[PDB]
Amino acid sequence: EKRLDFGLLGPLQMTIDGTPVPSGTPKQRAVLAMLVINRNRPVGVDALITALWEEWPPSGARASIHSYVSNLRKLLGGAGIDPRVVLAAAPPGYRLSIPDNTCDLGRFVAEKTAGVHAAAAGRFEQASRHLSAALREWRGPVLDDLRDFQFVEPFATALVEDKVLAHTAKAEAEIACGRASAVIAELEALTFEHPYREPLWTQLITAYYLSDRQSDALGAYRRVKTTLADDLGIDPGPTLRALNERILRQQPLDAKKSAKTTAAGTVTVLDQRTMASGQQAVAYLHDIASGRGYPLQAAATRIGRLHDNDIVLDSANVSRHHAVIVDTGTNYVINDLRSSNGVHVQHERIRSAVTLNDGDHIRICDHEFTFQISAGTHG
């Protein structure tokens, strides 16, 4: 009867006919957030308890969950639907059944994807329009009002991978359309906010160079070089180094080819996430030593030594809560939870979080896995 909408890209929002509806106390809001994050999938009661109270649930935690569900159903009933259908009780747990496009993140995902296919086809004006639409879905810090809940941290961090990618693809499209000069200012702002993001620097350096500002381009490379050296102790990657070498030689750039090539790569990623049926493929962690396969079943897959983890690794050197893999709807990103021994992807220690690629080697202490995005063909 009335429009139901939800928001994760900023403070948690539930809106009915465009009017925000306050969704309860922080614990109740965390229930809603968990359900929206896992929209159209069941969330177990045990998972809800861990998210709300991590280490110290009260003795009546389950009664509280039942109350939160009842409360949330009353709120949902204001949209004139059957709350028991929309927020249904699984014997597994609870499931919020909502269309993807009724969630701000769902719209972000859809627009980004449309922008990818457009750029891959050389339709850069349209790609830029879709990317503008995606970025408009962001209101503020992810689940800003629930920042004191631990589950928010890896999820919010993962979604920055996606936002940065969208900013970069937007810059590429604009540059491909001949508007390099008009994106310099935003890129300057973005490289300050995200100083270690080489793809953003790549686009800024490109934009200077194609705006007849060669010396500024070279100066920007020197700046990121110093930043990466001093702050992180690393050299710039091959993409930055190759760009620098072209500019030093006053060689031409092909911004249209670049934007097409990036998009084509992303289409490959989109393909491996999708089955012939159109449903998302289930990503797996395969243990190399044992052959045991661990499906990623929720938005967040928690890994550690403690029994409450989704993937439990018994070794003494593994942290109680060691890592989390987050499915953003666009990428899988692994997060190191300030573990004693760290997380190693493709045989190097990760700094905070990295986006996972299909077939990546993942090491947690002595445990070694293959991360597979593409659907399995044997079992």
Binding site: N317, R320, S339, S340, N341, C365
Partner: peptide, 8 residues
């Protein structure tokens, strides 16, 4: 387990 993590 809730046992202190061993160091590498």
């Amino acid at each position: 387990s809730l046992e202190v993590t061993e160091a590498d």
